[PDB]
Design a protein around this nucleic acid. Structure first.
Ligand SMILES: [Zn+2]
Ligand SMILES: [Zn+2]
Lengths: 75, 120, 97, 147, 56, 183, 377
DNA sequence: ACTGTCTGGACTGGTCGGCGCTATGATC
DNA sequence: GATCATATTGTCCAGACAGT
């Protein structure tokens, strides 16, 4: 994606993820959390892993569906 | 903080609050339970009724002529003057001393002479 | 009388099926659902005093702007562990609608 | 000679010093003197020409852990040998903590200080009414110094 | 315009949740059925009032 | 100080009110939510008048209720510092007098009623002066200026209001007319 | 806990060393020119989305500032700083005769050096002026966790079994109290350094007991204690063991047996399993009679119910004494936790879950025996 | 600029049940 | 004979680093 070959481990795609919680949950927890604390990183919780950890709906499947309904509904 | 945001606000006199509380009392009477509102609303309605110095239309017209009379006054102190309805210089002096302005006696006399009409 | 573990792989198949509400019901609603008070000023966890019947944030104050947020108890334990590790997590609250 | 530090078990420095002194007397160790202040916990001072003598003296004792690899200047331990009252160095108006006595683990404010009777009068800060109490000077510990 | 599986599942879940805590059924349903069954019957009858908001 | 405000808010309407009018259900929910509490920014929330505009519903996961953006008018009463009020004494206490000035009752201290060394009379619950010989009783037109406002809690009864009567022009209406007679 | 002397956080030791190498010792500013500072400030805004670019920029800035031995802001000479694991910093100072000797930088000196860094140079060093000050990486106050984070149990013999964190905090408190008492007693500097090193070791083991170059903290029996770092990482950590995956309620597990007579959409559920697992069904107009019959049957008669929830939200257990009273009290809005019936939807899963087909939804079929039934296709 | 060397890390999920282990030396 | 402080400080892959 970034113009260079990247692995799928902690030094590749997961390592350059913008989410702090997703990075810390996979392989390296202490180092990623401390590095985020040093930089004052902000996690926007736009991913799936962070929403799973918190307990919020994931942005996939039915989580991206928005519903509307007209209130004056009668049988 | 009521709601998400506030669009507009307005300062009303005692008579407008009395009319609104009477409307709410009628709405509560239209409801099935015999209690129209809670203790505070009923107490406010009773106080406004016992201090109903002027009609709501009279209060509104006094407010708009007060707005059109002078520019340094605002809606809040105009409604305060409508509710108090002063008749001399001592009361207006002691209610304007703590305000941001200290008006000279001539404009106070003018205010007295315009609010003298349609008074009880 | 223990329960059955819903591991990471089970979460993976639930995600692949696109069932967000089922994931919420399994991992959160049926396992460790709890509610906490979060301060809206500094993001710290507010304190609820049962003696006085009031909720306030001890570090910053803010006796008024306190909101209740539901989440897993494991996440609260993680926040406590992070605070014990001299790391400050600031929870920025957002309206549901 | 040179002052050396021996790390020992906390609260049992006097017995370890006595055992070291007895061993040096019996086996003719080249030990000059041993100093064990009561305020210092877990550490004793032994004067010897070299640290090898201290290492040979303290070995064979379960309660002597190790000798600190360094030499203490005499000015550092000079104030320990001087005799000063525990009440002295305390001024009224500050906050102190009572280490021992019937008021263990209580914060107090110093009210009156007298060096003649070696006693210090303090007032508890957690008490709803001021009740001055008389306590020994060595029992208190200075938390803060104000006025 | 056709409903996706995720959109249909979300609509059925919302309708069943509404039926569970009120929201009387707009069509005749057999007795003893679950609110999920009532929502499924409503979807089969094409009487659902819930729409889907799509990005534009 | 009575105030009228236009407030836009998101209203949650339960499925049991689906068959009713959206405006009526929104008004009922807003009355159940905001009426009867004290707001820090706006003061005492007295009543919800009507709902002007209502938007279409939005369904969020985990809740079957619909959420609507509603515009409504709120009548509120807010006490401010150094604000003159007119009221009637409703309660008498040894430590002061309580005057009903609206949804809340202020407190005037025993030294604060007038420029005299007034003492309390327990038999009739009245204040009797020494030199002025003035008497305060039930149902008296009085005027006072607020000097203390407490917004510590959202409960209206827990909040306290302190007013003064030391200053000239504050007191009973008969006393005010007596003062104006000399001038 | 108010520490008598400041200690270095083991999780920020490399960052502390990097910042010390990249900052002026006495001047306090970053060892970069004003033009270079401006250029890096403009370059930071361009590359902000990708954290890798920010990391490379931080590394480049640190490398550029490390080689500088004279601060451009004040001209003060600088000396190389050597980092020794875990939290030991050495400064290669120069003697009067030109000899090079290593000077140990105490945590107090490190914190004083870090305090002089202005807020403007913090973004260049990868730190936030309001969120992460450089001096906060040197611990002065240690936050002891709540007792809920470190629960204490009692054994069958009455002996309390404290947590590993509790023992580590006991050691930390004891060492800190001894250090404070020795400081108040005017102890020589040699004792002070020894107690400071002991407190630093205890704090480092408390933060992470698996630090390289550190003997791990051991229990009395010889058990290596696990600390806050071990509670988050690993398979049994907070993330993988409790956050990404956890045990759940309303679940069952038993041996499976073939059943060709049922459809592929159906699963055979034991009667004992069905009578234990419950589905909460709200009382509506079209199912009041069925749920009333379920309540009347009770937990011991299939099809029945085990619990009943009133609209107020409280849970009432159903037994023989009160099954009739609850049944005649049932109304719209109540919740009845009835037993599993035919046609109910359940999740059927086999481990390991290699693909998304490992969990599928079936239809409940109640069978008398004790085994799950799955169709052969 | 290459090249060998030091250091850090992760080690497939679930389930079944069992079997230990969570003080001690020195006064008063 | 009862209590009290104290109790120690396994191969392989990838990134960073002295050496030539
Ligand atoms: Zn706060
Ligand atoms: Zn400089």
């Amino acid at each position: 994606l970034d113009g260079v070959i990247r692995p799928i481990g902690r030094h590749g795609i997961v390592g350059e993820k913008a989410s702090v919680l997703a990075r810390a949950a996979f392989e390296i927890t202490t180092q990623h959390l401390f590095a985020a604390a040093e930089r004052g990183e902000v996690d926007p919780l736009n991913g799936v892993v962070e929403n799973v950890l918190i307990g919020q709906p994931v942005p996939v499947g039915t989580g991206i569906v928005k519903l509307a309904m007209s209130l004056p509904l009668r049988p | 903080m009521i709601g998400r945001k506030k669009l507009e606000e307005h300062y009303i006199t005692i008579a407008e609050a009395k009319e609104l509380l009477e409307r709410r009392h009628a709405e509560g009477l239209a409801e099935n339970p015999e209690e129209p509102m809670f203790y505070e609303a009923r107490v406010s309605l009773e106080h406004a009724e016992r201090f109903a110095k002027l009609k709501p239309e009279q209060a509104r017209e006094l407010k708009e002529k007060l707005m059109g009379l002078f520019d340094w006054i605002n809606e809040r102190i105009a409604a305060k003057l409508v509710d108090i309805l002063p008749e001399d210089y001592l009361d207006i002096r002691v209610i304007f001393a703590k305000e941001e302005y200290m008006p000279t006696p001539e404009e106070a006399e003018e205010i007295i002479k315009v609010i003298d009409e349609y008074r009880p | 009388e223990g329960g059955l573990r819903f591991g990471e792989m089970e979460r993976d198949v639930l995600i692949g099926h696109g069932a967000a509400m089922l994931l919420i019901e399994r991992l959160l609603e049926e396992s460790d659902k709890t509610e906490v008070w979060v301060c809206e000023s500094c993001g710290h966890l507010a304190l609820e005093d049962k003696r006085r019947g009031k909720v306030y944030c001890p570090v910053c104050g803010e006796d008024e702007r306190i909101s209740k947020v539901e989440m897993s108890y494991a996440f609260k334990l993680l926040l406590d562990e992070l605070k014990a590790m001299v790391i400050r997590p600031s929870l920025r609250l957002k309206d549901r609608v | 000679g040179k002052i050396f530090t021996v790390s020992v078990t906390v609260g049992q420095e006097t017995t370890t010093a006595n055992l070291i002194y007895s061993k040096a007397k019996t086996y003719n160790l080249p030990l000059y003197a041993i100093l064990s202040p009561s305020k210092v916990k877990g550490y004793i001072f032994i004067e010897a020409p070299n640290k090898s003598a201290v290492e040979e003296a303290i070995r064979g004792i379960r309660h002597a852990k190790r000798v600190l690899p360094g030499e203490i200047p005499f000015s550092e331990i000079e104030h320990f040998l001087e005799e000063k009252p525990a009440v002295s160095g305390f001024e009224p108006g500050d906050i102190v903590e009572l280490i021992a006595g019937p008021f263990k683990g209580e914060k107090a404010k110093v009210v009156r200080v007298d060096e003649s009777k070696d006693e210090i009068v303090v007032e508890l800060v957690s008490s709803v009414v001021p009740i001055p109490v008389t306590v020994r000077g060595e029992y208190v510990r200075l938390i803060s110094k104000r006025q | 315009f056709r409903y996706t599986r995720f959109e249909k599942a979300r609509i059925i879940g919302a309708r069943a949740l509404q039926i569970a805590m009120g929201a009387p059924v707009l069509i005749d349903v057999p007795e003893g059925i679950t609110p999920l069954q009532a929502a499924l019957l409503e979807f089969e009858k094409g009487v659902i009032p819930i729409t889907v908001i799509r990005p534009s | 100080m009575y105030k009228l405000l236009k407030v836009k808010d998101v209203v949650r309407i339960p499925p049991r009110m689906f068959t009713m009018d959206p405006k009526e259900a929104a008004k009922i929910v807003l009355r159940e939510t905001y009426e009867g509490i004290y707001d820090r920014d706006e003061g005492v929330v007295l009543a919800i008048l009507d709902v002007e505009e209502i938007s279409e519903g939005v369904i969020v996961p985990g809740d079957g209720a619909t959420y609507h953006e509603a515009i409504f008018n709120v009548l509120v009463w807010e006490p401010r510092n150094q604000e003159v009020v007119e009221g009637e004494v409703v309660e008498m206490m040894p430590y002061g007098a309580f005057i009903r000035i609206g949804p809340m009752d202020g407190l005037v201290h025993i030294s604060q009623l007038m420029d005299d060394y007034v003492v309390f009379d327990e038999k009739n619950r009245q204040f009797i002066g020494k030199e002025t010989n003035r008497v305060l009783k039930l149902g008296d037109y009085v005027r006072a200026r607020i000097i203390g406002v407490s917004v510590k809690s959202r409960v209206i009864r827990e909040n306290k209001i302190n007013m003064t009567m030391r200053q000239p022009g504050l007191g009973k209406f008969e006393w005010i007319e007596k003062e104006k007679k000399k001038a | 806990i108010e520490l008598a002397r400041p200690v270095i956080h083991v999780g920020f030791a490399k960052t502390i060393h990097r910042v010390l190498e990249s900052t002026c010792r006495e001047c306090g500013r970053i060892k970069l020119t004003d033009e270079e500072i401006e250029e890096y400030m403009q370059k930071f805004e361009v590359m902000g989305d990708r954290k890798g670019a920010v990391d490379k920029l931080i590394k480049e800035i640190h490398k550029k500032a490390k080689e500088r031995m004279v601060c451009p802001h004040c001209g003060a000479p600088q000396f190389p700083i050597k980092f020794e694991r875990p939290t030991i910093y050495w400064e290669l100072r120069k003697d009067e005769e030109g000899n090079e000797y290593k000077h140990r930088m105490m945590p107090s000196e490190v914190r004083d050096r870090l305090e002089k860094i202005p807020d403007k140079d913090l973004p260049l060093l990868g730190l936030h002026p309001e969120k992460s000050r450089p001096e906060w990486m040197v611990l002065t106050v240690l936050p002891v966790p709540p007792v809920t984070m470190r629960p204490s149990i009692t054994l069958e013999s009455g002996i309390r079994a404290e947590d590993d964190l509790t023992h580590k905090l006991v050691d930390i408190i004891r060492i800190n109290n001894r250090l404070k008492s020795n400081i108040e007693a005017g102890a020589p500097q040699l004792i002070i350094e020894d107690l400071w090193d002991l407190l630093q070791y205890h704090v480092t083991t408390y933060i992470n007991n698996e630090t390289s170059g550190v003997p791990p903290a051991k229990h009395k029996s010889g058990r290596p204690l696990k600390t806050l770092a071990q509670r988050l990482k690993g398979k049994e950590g907070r993330f993988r063991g409790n956050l990404s995956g956890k045990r759940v309620n309303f679940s069952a597990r038993t041996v499976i047996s073939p059943d060709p007579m049922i459809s592929i959409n159906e699963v055979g559920v034991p009667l004992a399993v069905a009578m234990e697992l419950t589905v909460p069904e709200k009382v509506t107009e079209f199912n009041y009679e069925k749920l009333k019959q379920r309540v009347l049957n009770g937990p011991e008669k299939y099809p029945g119910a085990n619990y009943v929830i009133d609209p107020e939200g409280r849970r009432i257990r159903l037994m023989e004494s009160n099954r009739e009273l609850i049944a005649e009290k049932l109304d719209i809005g109540w919740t009845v936790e009835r037993h599993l019936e035919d046609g109910d939807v359940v999740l059927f899963n086999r481990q390991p879950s290699l693909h998304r087909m490992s969990i599928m939804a079936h239809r409940v079929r109640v069978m008398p025996y004790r085994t799950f039934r799955l169709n052969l296709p």
